[PDB]
Design an enzyme around this catalytic site. Structure first.
Site, PDB file in Angstrom:
ATOM      1  N   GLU B  49       0.886  -1.154   0.000  1.00  8.16           N
ATOM      2  CA  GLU B  49       0.000   0.000   0.000  1.00  8.16           C
ATOM      3  C   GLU B  49       0.928   1.208   0.000  1.00  8.16           C
ATOM      4  OE1 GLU B  49      -2.289   1.228   3.418  1.00  8.16           O
ATOM      5  OE2 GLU B  49      -4.122   1.412   2.201  1.00  8.16           O
ATOM      6  N   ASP B  60      -4.141  10.990   8.994  1.00  2.87           N
ATOM      7  CA  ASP B  60      -2.814  10.513   9.364  1.00  2.87           C
ATOM      8  C   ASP B  60      -2.301  11.204  10.602  1.00  2.87           C
ATOM      9  OD1 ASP B  60      -1.851   8.484   7.530  1.00  2.87           O
ATOM     10  OD2 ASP B  60      -2.076  10.023   5.966  1.00  2.87           O
ATOM     11  N   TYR B 175     -10.889  -3.132   3.515  1.00  2.36           N
ATOM     12  CA  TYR B 175     -10.038  -2.607   4.579  1.00  2.36           C
ATOM     13  C   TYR B 175     -10.825  -2.618   5.896  1.00  2.36           C
ATOM     14  CZ  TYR B 175      -6.120   0.136   6.547  1.00  2.36           C
ATOM     15  OH  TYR B 175      -5.017   0.564   7.273  1.00  2.36           O
TER      16      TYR B 175
END
Ligand SMILES: Cc1ncc(COP(=O)(O)O)c(CN[C@H](CNc2ccccc2O)C(=O)O)c1O
Ligand SMILES: Cc1ncc(COP(=O)(O)O)c(CN[C@H](CNc2ccccc2O)C(=O)O)c1O
Ligand SMILES: O=C(NCCOP(=O)(O)O)c1ccc(OC(F)(F)F)cc1
Ligand SMILES: O=C(NCCOP(=O)(O)O)c1ccc(OC(F)(F)F)cc1
Ligand code: NA
Ligand code: NA
Ligand code: NA
Ligand code: NA
Ligand code: NA
Ligand code: NA
Lengths: 395, 268, 395, 268
Positions: B49, B60, B175
């Site tokens: 990824e 993030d 995911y």
């Protein structure tokens, strides 16, 4: 699925990581429920009137329009408790937070007025408040940092990126994605993911509602135009909303021109950026050719934001509202002129709107025009910044 | 292509889970990034990824924010990332390669043109962090038209509607998000929720990989025991890059050792 | 000879050098003429409403009275344009100045709120404003110095004596004795020579008038007591005036106790000084045994004045009003408590009144009492002073 | 006594005006003040006006404010001023002595007791700066009961009512104020208003002395030509004290020279 339309034409939506969608849907549902809840409406109304001091005055300028055919009124949001319009919708969102059983508040701030509003609301209503503020803004809007901390709020300086508003926004959203079960994100402008642009408009629309009632009473007619500054879009949409269907009334929003549009150091995405996806919305963004978000600039921390709320992008696209820009220096002149000739110290953000109104008058001084400027805040937070600048000039 | 299907077919035959490292493309520079990626593959990475540096990475934590900052300091742009992706595919024809994108970089000059570009360089999947399924239509449609798998998050707070939509919309892998919050190695994700794993399988979703805060071999083996098809680790790997900036040789050795241990834990 | 009574029992009068008597008589005559002049009343009323933002809110405390039988309202003079009650009577006196054809204004200030009010009024109404401010106060109330200068007023630091309020008073009066033909002395409290104590009361009485109307509407009865701080006496008499004939309503004025009455470092002449003649009036004064004026002390610049208006001395003598004192530390606690629990940042002056109200409640928590505190100003001018103190403590 | 009447009777016989210096009692200290006063008298002072240091002298400019500050720095109190006044009278039995008081010092522990105290030490007049005729009743009544002349200001903005009241209430001399403002040598007073001089005489007022900003012999002779009975100088004299603080000998010589020139100008 939503209860309300998340878009304004092409603009808006809910571009957040999947983890945050239930929070947004919960918030939308609570807002819709609250809007039809007489108890909520009465509590909100009581706080607005007896705590914040609504309705605010509508002041006719006595001096600055002398010798022209412009009549200029100032909607006095600078007289609201806290010192800016930001207090209106914070009170409403704080009641929503308690309605959803949240015990904590996260907010970004730039001018520190939204942060002060969030702090004072959290002190009154028993919420634990943490505020993200760009480190640059912590310095240039320091009086509000003191006020926020005095009211028991945690103020967290953000040094990343430009160390201003968008970086505080980034941190607020990162925090919320992990704390949404117990914290409400009290977004401070009419932007971000749905339902924020809608909720913020609806909890600010009393500005335009009062203005219309007031100008009708004093002048027997609607204004030719209402003029507000635009950083994220809350004070402007709050002024504009009740006038949107009155087609004769110009809706004029004023983005910061910074050092000048040509320098690239400005905060005018609506007219000088291009549509993009960031901070949870599809909206005009200052961005590089390859799609990185550009840093904005303005003398005023409250306008130093490189995007803009989607309803403004929409109103502009259909031509219902017009958007212009006003530079640092033009804003500074308007600041000084209001202090010395009307005895009102305006926020540097609000000064951008006043500056544009003064241009409309000066450019065409025999044009009959009845104008209202939304005086969105008082300039206490700005007096030291402005002093240093004016001194560094030689004035 | 069916690089993901072929991978999962093979992993199932060997009765093992996948281990999938994440790194930011161009961190700490283009050449060293390319070497890091080769080392991840040599050490046993089943797929990759890869993040394209974005100015404002809202999903993030500090580790990957700093990776983005290092890549930008080296002048890395999306155009250069696509140049690296071509070199990667040229060396490694079978490994599945997924991009982790922020929406603006995909939308910027045409959603269709972005996915066409991915197909051209041989990328296999794209996960757009800030595009929920609710906003996914033109993204997943463009992805499928260009033989790219659109990858979606199944968060721990997922309801039945979201399970059905993720199962229907997504390809390649699902995911399975380990926890709330943003990426980070020290905030350890919980075990895979059994009820989500079972529902994803009932609805014929793409195989589930667990991600967020997966930083140790024990978490990898536990994800697979829990029924996941594998696990993704990002921040833990990026920290090794950050720790060894002064020594590219020691950076590579530590990356190799860690990926090897992580991959070994995926094995039956 | 005068048109109105210059005395309140023994207290008051016109103890100025003979040169200034015609100015005082002129001012008294203009005031009397203005009071019966519908044009003047309408202009004053319009400025109060549309410029200053009257009526101000009456806020019920939500949290600080929890678990007691005290209901506490705050009269929100902190929401008045300028940030304190001082703005009310300045507007009225400014109109008087123009009525008498004066082109200049002299004012003393201590908290800087009266100076800010005088500056903003002079900017609006076209007057040239000079302000005397004790050099100590220039430092500890610095935000208002910036505001005053931004509005075009000349701010003159006074280094003589204690470099605080009485020394600014002295300079203002010396200046006026030479400039009265062209300058009006806009005295900033209900003290000084007649007709100032009367004019200041009459141009502040809207505080109590609104309060009565508001408390009647919300509670169906009058307050058990109204509580205001007292430095010179304007905000207190403005609150008290409309209640003087309502004998059931306690009138409670709060002088600063400074470091404590026993230290001699306080500003409580009414209860701890003795009658004397100074600053144009016969009134209680902090004075030495042989009749020199003592210097006062308070943490708050606005209360740091060693005398008090004569109507308060009178009301106390006949027992109609009661006067107490509150120390620096008690005021600081009340400041902090309002910030953290009601989300309002009060002036340190106003905090003295709040502190006494909190004592009334805490000392007798099962006593049913309905109290109004005059929240005479906002604490923006004080936030840096308070921060330094609180930090120097270890908080 | 009639020290003022005797003085004016004598000055009239010599066809001259009075010159009356003002100083602050106890400036720069008690002993030097006493010497300054002896020097003023030796140099030709016809009478004295003497200030008692007060904390907040609202009618006084910087020169006399600083005199008050010097006297306080030397510990001077009203009690000590009365001690000096006794020594002065003991040396100089005939010279008229007037006090210039602020009201609080007179009112402080009894208006009557203050004037009794003045009579006891042999003071001849008291002018209370901040007591207009409108407030003067208990002051002038106490003064007369104790054979002290109450002295009143006839300001340049005086109307006919004030002229009549000053004429009726005052004794000793009428203080004809030269200008608005506070005391000071550099702000020069105007010439005596002819209309006030004539009206004061028509109404049998005490003789007029001009005061405020009288700082030069030319102003003294001009006051007398204008019809005044004389002139008072304060700040101009105090400046000589302030200038020569380091040299008491030179202080005295300069005081003597100035008072002599001022007094000479009063002579026909
Ligand atoms: C007096 C005044 N007038 C106008 C403005 C402009 O804000 P607006 O366009 O919403 O009306 C501000 C914005 N103030 C900032 C920025 N608040 C802010 C701005 C952009 C994005 C997020 C934000 O919290 C704040 O208080 O945090 C202001 O204080
Ligand atoms: C918010 C607030 N609350 C209360 C007060 C106390 O003043 P007051 O007793 O009149 O109501 C002040 C006094 N403020 C000073 C002192 N003003 C002042 C005080 C004493 C003598 C002369 C003065 O100009 C000023 O603004 O100059 C204030 O700012
Ligand atoms: O895989 C990702 N990051 C690397 C792995 O996480 P970590 O090990 O904590 O660094 C990653 C990051 C964000 C993302 O979108 C959304 F935020 F919505 F989940 C999806 C995957
Ligand atoms: O005589 C006085 N000062 C000394 C002479 O003045 P200057 O020469 O300017 O120092 C003097 C000072 C004040 C005074 O009361 C009032 F202020 F009301 F006039 C009367 C006389
Ligand atoms: Na913007
Ligand atoms: Na706006
Ligand atoms: Na774009
Ligand atoms: Na006082
Ligand atoms: Na008061
Ligand atoms: Na006394």
């Amino acid at each position: 699925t939503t209860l309300l339309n998340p878009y304004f034409g092409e603009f808006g939506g809910m571009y957040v990581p999947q983890i945050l969608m239930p929070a947004l849907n919960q918030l939308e549902e609570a807002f819709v429920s609250a809007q039809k809840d007489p108890e909520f409406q009465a509590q909100f109304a009581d706080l607005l009137k007896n705590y914040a001091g609504r309705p605010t005055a509508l002041t006719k300028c006595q001096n600055i329009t002398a010798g022209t055919r412009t009549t200029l009124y100032l909607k006095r949001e600078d007289l609201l408790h806290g010192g800016a319009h930001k207090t209106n919708q914070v009170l409403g969102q704080a009641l929503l937070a308690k309605r959803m059983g949240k015990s904590e508040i996260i907010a970004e701030t730039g001018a520190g007025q939204h942060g002060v509003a969030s702090a004072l609301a959290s002190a009154l209503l028993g919420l634990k408040c943490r505020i993200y503020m760009g480190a640059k803004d912590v310095e240039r809007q320091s009086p509000n940092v003191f006020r926020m901390r005095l009211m028991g709020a945690e103020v967290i300086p953000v040094h990343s990126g430009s160390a201003t508003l968008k970086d505080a926004c980034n941190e607020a959203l990162r925090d919320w994605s992990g704390s949404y079960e117990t914290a409400h994100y009290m977004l401070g402008t009419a932007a971000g993911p749905h339902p924020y642009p809608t909720i913020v408009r609806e909890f600010q629309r009393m500005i335009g509602e009062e203005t219309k009632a007031q100008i009708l009473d004093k002048e027997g007619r609607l204004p030719d135009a209402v003029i507000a500054c635009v950083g994220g879009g809350s004070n402007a949409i709050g002024m504009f909303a009740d006038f949107i269907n009155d087609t004769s009334v110009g809706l004029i929003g004023v983005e910061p021109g910074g050092h000048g549009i040509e320098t690239g150091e400005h905060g005018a995405p609506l007219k000088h950026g291009r549509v993009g996806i960031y901070f949870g919305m599809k909206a005009p963004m200052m961005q590089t050719a390859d799609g990185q978000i550009e840093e904005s600039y303005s003398i005023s921390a409250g306008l130093d934001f490189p995007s803009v709320g989607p309803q403004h992008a929409y109103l502009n696209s259909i031509g219902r509202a017009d958007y212009v820009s006003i530079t640092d220096d033009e804003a500074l002149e308007a600041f000084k002129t209001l202090c010395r000739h009307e005895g009102i110290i305006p926020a540097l953000e609000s000064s951008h709107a006043l500056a544009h109104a003064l241009k409309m008058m000066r450019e065409q001084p025999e044009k009959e025009q009845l104008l209202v400027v939304n005086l969105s805040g008082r300039g206490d937070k700005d007096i030291f910044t402005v002093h240093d600048i004016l001194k560094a000039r030689g004035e | 292509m069916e690089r993901y299907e072929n991978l999962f077919a093979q992993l199932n035959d060997r009765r093992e889970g996948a281990f999938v490292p994440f790194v930011t493309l161009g961190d700490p520079g283009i050449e060293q990034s390319l070497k890091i990626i080769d080392t991840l593959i040599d050490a046993g990475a089943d797929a990759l990824e890869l993040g394209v540096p974005f100015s404002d990475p809202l999903a993030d934590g500090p580790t990957i924010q700093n990776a983005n900052l290092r890549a930008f300091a080296a002048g890395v742009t999306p155009a250069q990332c696509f140049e690296m992706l071509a070199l990667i595919r040229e060396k490694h024809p079978t490994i599945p390669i997924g991009l982790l994108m922020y929406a603006n970089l995909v939308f910027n000059n045409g959603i269709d043109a972005f996915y066409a570009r991915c197909e051209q360089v041989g990328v296999d999947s794209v996960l757009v962090a800030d595009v929920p399924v609710e906003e996914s239509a033109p993204f997943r449609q463009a992805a499928l038209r260009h033989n790219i798998a659109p990858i979606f998050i199944c968060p721990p707070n997922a309801d039945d509607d979201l399970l059905r939509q993720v199962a229907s919309y997504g390809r390649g892998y699902t995911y399975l998000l380990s926890r709330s919050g943003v990426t980070g190695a020290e905030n350890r994700g919980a075990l895979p929720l059994h009820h989500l794993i079972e529902k994803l399988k009932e609805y014929h979703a793409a195989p589930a990989l667990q991600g967020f805060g997966i930083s140790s071999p024990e978490q990898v083996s536990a994800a697979v025991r829990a029924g996941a098809a594998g696990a993704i680790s990002g921040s833990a790997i990026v920290k090794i890059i950050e720790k060894n900036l002064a020594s590219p040789k020691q950076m590579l050795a530590e990356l190799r050792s860690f990926v090897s241990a992580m991959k070994a834990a995926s094995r039956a």
